[PDB]
Design a protein around this ligand. Sequence first.
Ligand SMILES: *C(=O)/C=C/c1ccc(O)cc1
Length: 125
Amino acid sequence: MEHVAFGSEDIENTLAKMDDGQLDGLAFGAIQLDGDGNILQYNAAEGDITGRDPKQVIGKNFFKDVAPCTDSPEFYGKFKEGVASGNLNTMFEYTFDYQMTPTKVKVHMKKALSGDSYWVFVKRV
Ligand SMILES: *C(=O)/C=C/c1ccc(O)cc1
């Protein structure tokens, strides 16, 4: 395992050192998005939660293509305000229900330490 707790205050500094292989050792799902919502990184734990194959969703748009259930003011709306503002740090519960059994999760969205990238972290509840 990589030992990093979900919700940790300095998580963006810790994850700045990991490559795709290290990200697969986290105890929670991790997605890195660009400012348009395209998927740059997608770890093994996220694929275990949602059924998606990580290598197949990299490059797709999360809000348009992969996760239309998140295209709502409650999820995408928060993301886009964060990108526009250049700051984002929010945690909320959500249900993922597209082409899968409805699954309740906790989501943490946080701006990355690098400029135009954003993390989405997911764990079951
Ligand atoms: C709603 O459409 C949610 C879909 C979804 C969430 C998270 C993922 O990693 C993949 C699909």
